[PDB]
Design a protein around this motif. Structure first.
Motif, PDB file in Angstrom:
ATOM      1  N   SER A  12     -38.618  34.537  -8.470  1.00  0.00           N
ATOM      2  CA  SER A  12     -37.703  34.028  -7.288  1.00  0.00           C
ATOM      3  C   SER A  12     -37.753  35.068  -6.837  1.00  0.00           C
ATOM      4  N   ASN A  13     -36.889  35.111  -5.697  1.00  0.00           N
ATOM      5  CA  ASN A  13     -36.110  36.242  -4.729  1.00  0.00           C
ATOM      6  C   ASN A  13     -35.257  37.165  -5.401  1.00  0.00           C
ATOM      7  N   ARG A  14     -34.311  36.238  -6.008  1.00  0.00           N
ATOM      8  CA  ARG A  14     -33.353  36.943  -7.228  1.00  0.00           C
ATOM      9  C   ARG A  14     -33.754  38.180  -8.585  1.00  0.00           C
ATOM     10  N   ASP A  15     -34.810  38.382  -8.402  1.00  0.00           N
ATOM     11  CA  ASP A  15     -35.388  39.913  -9.239  1.00  0.00           C
ATOM     12  C   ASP A  15     -35.439  40.862  -8.466  1.00  0.00           C
ATOM     13  N   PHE A  16     -34.235  41.313  -8.458  1.00  0.00           N
ATOM     14  CA  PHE A  16     -33.411  42.435  -7.623  1.00  0.00           C
ATOM     15  C   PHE A  16     -33.951  43.640  -8.375  1.00  0.00           C
ATOM     16  N   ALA A  17     -34.256  43.870  -9.891  1.00  0.00           N
ATOM     17  CA  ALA A  17     -35.517  45.335 -10.314  1.00  0.00           C
ATOM     18  C   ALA A  17     -36.385  45.290  -9.733  1.00  0.00           C
ATOM     19  N   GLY A  18     -37.076  43.742  -9.785  1.00  0.00           N
ATOM     20  CA  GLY A  18     -38.706  44.242  -9.492  1.00  0.00           C
ATOM     21  C   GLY A  18     -38.343  44.560  -8.060  1.00  0.00           C
ATOM     22  N   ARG A  19     -37.674  44.286  -6.966  1.00  0.00           N
ATOM     23  CA  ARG A  19     -37.637  44.645  -5.180  1.00  0.00           C
ATOM     24  C   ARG A  19     -37.030  46.268  -5.742  1.00  0.00           C
ATOM     25  N   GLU A  20     -36.255  47.180  -6.072  1.00  0.00           N
ATOM     26  CA  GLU A  20     -35.936  47.612  -6.070  1.00  0.00           C
ATOM     27  C   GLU A  20     -36.653  48.841  -6.397  1.00  0.00           C
ATOM     28  N   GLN A  21     -37.947  48.474  -7.839  1.00  0.00           N
ATOM     29  CA  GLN A  21     -38.520  49.713  -8.136  1.00  0.00           C
ATOM     30  C   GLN A  21     -40.460  49.251  -7.264  1.00  0.00           C
ATOM     31  N   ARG A  22     -40.328  48.254  -6.511  1.00  0.00           N
ATOM     32  CA  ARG A  22     -41.372  48.586  -5.183  1.00  0.00           C
ATOM     33  C   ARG A  22     -40.604  49.125  -3.981  1.00  0.00           C
ATOM     34  N   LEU A  23     -39.330  48.893  -3.873  1.00  0.00           N
ATOM     35  CA  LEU A  23     -38.431  49.724  -2.762  1.00  0.00           C
ATOM     36  C   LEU A  23     -38.704  51.611  -3.128  1.00  0.00           C
ATOM     37  N   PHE A  24     -38.414  51.748  -4.502  1.00  0.00           N
ATOM     38  CA  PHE A  24     -38.249  53.073  -5.152  1.00  0.00           C
ATOM     39  C   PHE A  24     -39.857  54.054  -5.012  1.00  0.00           C
ATOM     40  N   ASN A  25     -41.124  53.333  -5.169  1.00  0.00           N
ATOM     41  CA  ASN A  25     -42.181  53.602  -5.366  1.00  0.00           C
ATOM     42  C   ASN A  25     -42.744  53.753  -3.499  1.00  0.00           C
ATOM     43  N   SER A  26     -42.288  52.845  -2.642  1.00  0.00           N
ATOM     44  CA  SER A  26     -42.790  52.873  -0.554  1.00  0.00           C
ATOM     45  C   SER A  26     -41.955  53.797  -0.682  1.00  0.00           C
ATOM     46  N   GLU A  27     -40.626  53.494  -0.699  1.00  0.00           N
ATOM     47  CA  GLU A  27     -39.839  55.203  -0.290  1.00  0.00           C
ATOM     48  C   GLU A  27     -40.363  56.900  -0.391  1.00  0.00           C
ATOM     49  N   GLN A  28     -40.687  56.945  -1.912  1.00  0.00           N
ATOM     50  CA  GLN A  28     -41.768  57.986  -2.505  1.00  0.00           C
ATOM     51  C   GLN A  28     -42.830  58.277  -1.674  1.00  0.00           C
ATOM     52  N   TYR A  29     -43.656  57.133  -0.792  1.00  0.00           N
ATOM     53  CA  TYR A  29     -44.761  56.778  -0.262  1.00  0.00           C
ATOM     54  C   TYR A  29     -44.532  57.245   0.726  1.00  0.00           C
ATOM     55  N   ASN A  30     -43.675  56.523   1.778  1.00  0.00           N
ATOM     56  CA  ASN A  30     -43.684  56.989   2.451  1.00  0.00           C
ATOM     57  C   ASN A  30     -42.808  58.542   3.396  1.00  0.00           C
ATOM     58  N   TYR A  31     -41.617  58.612   2.424  1.00  0.00           N
ATOM     59  CA  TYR A  31     -41.173  59.948   2.610  1.00  0.00           C
ATOM     60  C   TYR A  31     -41.891  61.675   3.147  1.00  0.00           C
ATOM     61  N   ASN A  32     -42.944  61.112   1.502  1.00  0.00           N
ATOM     62  CA  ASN A  32     -43.566  62.300   1.866  1.00  0.00           C
ATOM     63  C   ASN A  32     -44.798  62.325   3.134  1.00  0.00           C
ATOM     64  N   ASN A  33     -45.431  61.541   3.794  1.00  0.00           N
ATOM     65  CA  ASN A  33     -45.150  60.978   4.340  1.00  0.00           C
ATOM     66  C   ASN A  33     -44.627  61.635   6.533  1.00  0.00           C
ATOM     67  N   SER A  34     -43.472  61.156   5.984  1.00  0.00           N
ATOM     68  CA  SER A  34     -42.384  61.034   7.450  1.00  0.00           C
ATOM     69  C   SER A  34     -42.779  63.311   7.738  1.00  0.00           C
ATOM     70  N   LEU A  35     -41.680  63.697   8.604  1.00  0.00           N
ATOM     71  CA  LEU A  35     -41.500  64.986   8.822  1.00  0.00           C
ATOM     72  C   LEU A  35     -40.924  65.567   8.196  1.00  0.00           C
ATOM     73  N   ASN A  36     -40.137  64.892   7.061  1.00  0.00           N
ATOM     74  CA  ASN A  36     -38.628  65.545   5.783  1.00  0.00           C
ATOM     75  C   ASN A  36     -40.399  65.867   4.709  1.00  0.00           C
ATOM     76  N   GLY A  37     -41.676  65.721   4.966  1.00  0.00           N
ATOM     77  CA  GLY A  37     -41.964  65.745   4.053  1.00  0.00           C
ATOM     78  C   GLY A  37     -43.681  66.955   3.748  1.00  0.00           C
ATOM     79  N   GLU A  38     -43.770  66.975   1.913  1.00  0.00           N
ATOM     80  CA  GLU A  38     -44.224  67.874   1.589  1.00  0.00           C
ATOM     81  C   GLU A  38     -46.003  67.497   2.358  1.00  0.00           C
ATOM     82  N   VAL A  39     -46.635  68.505   3.217  1.00  0.00           N
ATOM     83  CA  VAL A  39     -47.686  68.572   2.054  1.00  0.00           C
ATOM     84  C   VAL A  39     -48.346  69.435   1.916  1.00  0.00           C
TER      85      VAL A  39
END
Lengths: 241, 241, 62, 241
Positions: B1-28
């Motif tokens: 279900s949509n109540r698997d918060f461990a699952g949703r948080e894991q996906r968000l943590f990885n997506s946030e890493q991806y996006n942060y690197n790609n932000s103007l605040n991130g590394e190249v």
């Protein structure tokens, strides 16, 4: 009386020095001190207009004794074992060439709110993995005022690396103060800032003891310093004889 | 279900890493790999905000075995004979310290259309003589996508130097992606780009084998790599657990 | 053991042995030596003494 | 007046030091000085409760220059040619590493009538052959009083080895004074004497000159000494300020 011109000129000469350094025409300077367990100290200095900084690798910060033995083969292996656990074939647990502490000093002409530091791991990543690294931290709040006779002669950030895991790369950056609304990087002057990057003078040396550093580097050059005993060094010049 | 918060948080943590690197605040990030005939590999890495690059001399790219013998006198002479034909007194026809190949890798946060390379001759001239040299080539079209699980984890340009005449100096540069209309070098932020030049962290090391490179440099740091067998390495993070 | 005997010695390796003779002179008397270092890394940072459980602890002397 | 308590306390502090050393709770000390033809001097010291001594081999008494060259292969051969005439293949007639003289000094807390010396040949035999050797000679009658300001600060036995045949091993022993009828080795205390054998502290160093010895070993430690010019050193403490 007000007819002591030698006295008035002496006060002006010192105040002019103070103010010139603080003008947009003046220097901004940074020093990185790395302290080793044998009591020796490596200093890196850079002096530039507008902005200034220093960036060193893990390897670059390790003690090197010029003209002497350095376990250089073993210390290649030390590097491999620091970049990845059990990656190397070093014949020692802890390399005495690793710095035990770092001090960063800026001239009083820096704007402290512009200071930035990237303290990376041994493979030059600011925060564990590149994907989640902000490339710097603004650390000005941690800088202590180095004072002499009431005058801020410098700014110091001191931090120990007393643990086996404190294996670092390091860059620091600061911008010259500018209380004006003139942007030194505006289109009219931006090529001069590019030139200042070429014009910056660098200095690097290893002193056998903090006593040599104080006596023969800090003092003769009227530089600011804060010693391990929390004692301030430098020269107060604003409205002083 | 949509109540698997461990699952949703894991996906968000990885997506946030991806996006942060790609932000103007991130590394190249950029890496230069130089491959030697003894199977060893030199890596140079640089990591910065906004833009990043590497520039090395002919001499700097030659294999150096830390703490070991290097034919250093003979290799001074090798240099003289490479800078000008019959200019040196080397006791060999071909120095095994010359790289056989180069690979340039950029992080996925680069904009590929900004990539520039200056591949000079051994005396650091981009195109035969300075008077007719454009100082760089825009080589983004030649970069291959390093992919893992459908995701672009990196960009690779690989080229061999299999001929006796392939004696090169090398610089490469790329700019962090910026799909916004905000110019990170506008007057409001240009001093921060100047500071980023000071803040950039550099790393350099020679690995005995591509296996060590993959095992102890690429993999532990979640870096992208393309091996000699055309195999991709890296970690997919966008919307993934 | 003597002061010298407790200093780190790396068997079959380099030891700064000439410089460490001088370190000794500068430790026996302040400014007595011509060592090229402030602190010798060969000096012990700590000591632990252990006795077997068959000792009488009230007999121990140092 | 008798109200100068600073004066009375100073006299008591010095007298207490004198007397404590002379108590059964105090130290007894011996020093062996070996004088070399290059003017350098080797000192061996031992400090213990109850009794104290030193025993060295022929080889141990030879000059050794720490961190320098020593003709060590040739000096192995010198040893062979000293143990048996024409037994070695040394490339010299006389080794300059052989001591030219010996001085034995005891602290003033020794009982001089207890002093014993075994001066052997180069193969560690006291008197030509073991079968006819008494294992020591009682040499106290030959000890001169080292005096300062009227006070015996030490005892000295000095002897030259000016001949080619003076090739010696050497042991010396003395017992702490004990004017009481309490035997420090009786059953009640004998285990403490055994422990004192473990507790004894030894010191060994080579000084470049007798001047260094006097300035940086004898004087700073308030030790007794008699120099080559027959001059006494030490500190008088009995009832003195």
């Amino acid at each position: 009386s007000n007819r002591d011109f030698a006295g008035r000129e002496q006060r002006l000469f010192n105040s002019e020095q103070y103010n010139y350094n603080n003008s947009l025409n003046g220097e901004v300077s940074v020093w990185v001190y790395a302290y080793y367990s044998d009591g020796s100290v490596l200093v890196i200095n850079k002096n530039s207009q507008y902005k200034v900084g220093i960036s060193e690798t893990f390897k670059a910060l390790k003690e090197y004794r010029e003209g002497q033995h350095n376990d250089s083969y073993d210390e290649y292996e030390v590097n491999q074992s620091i970049y990845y656990p059990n990656g190397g074939d070093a014949r020692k647990f802890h390399s005495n060439a690793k710095p035990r502490a770092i001090q960063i000093i800026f001239s009083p002409s820096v704007n402290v709110r512009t200071i930035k530091m990237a303290k990376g791991n041994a493979v030059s990543v600011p925060d564990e993995y590149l994907q989640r690294s902000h490339p710097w931290e603004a650390t000005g709040i941690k800088y202590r005022k180095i004072k002499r006779d009431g005058e801020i002669v410098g700014y110091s950030h001191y931090f120990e690396l007393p643990h086996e895991y404190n294996s670092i790369s390091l860059a620091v950056s600061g911008v010259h103060k500018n209380p004006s609304s003139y942007n030194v990087g505006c289109c009219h002057n931006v090529m001069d800032v590019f030139q200042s990057c070429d014009l910056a003078l660098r200095f690097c040396n290893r002193y056998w003891a903090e006593l040599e550093l104080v006596n023969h580097y800090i003092s003769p050059n009227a530089y600011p310093y804060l010693d391990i005993n929390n004692h301030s060094y430098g020269v107060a010049l604003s409205n002083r004889q």
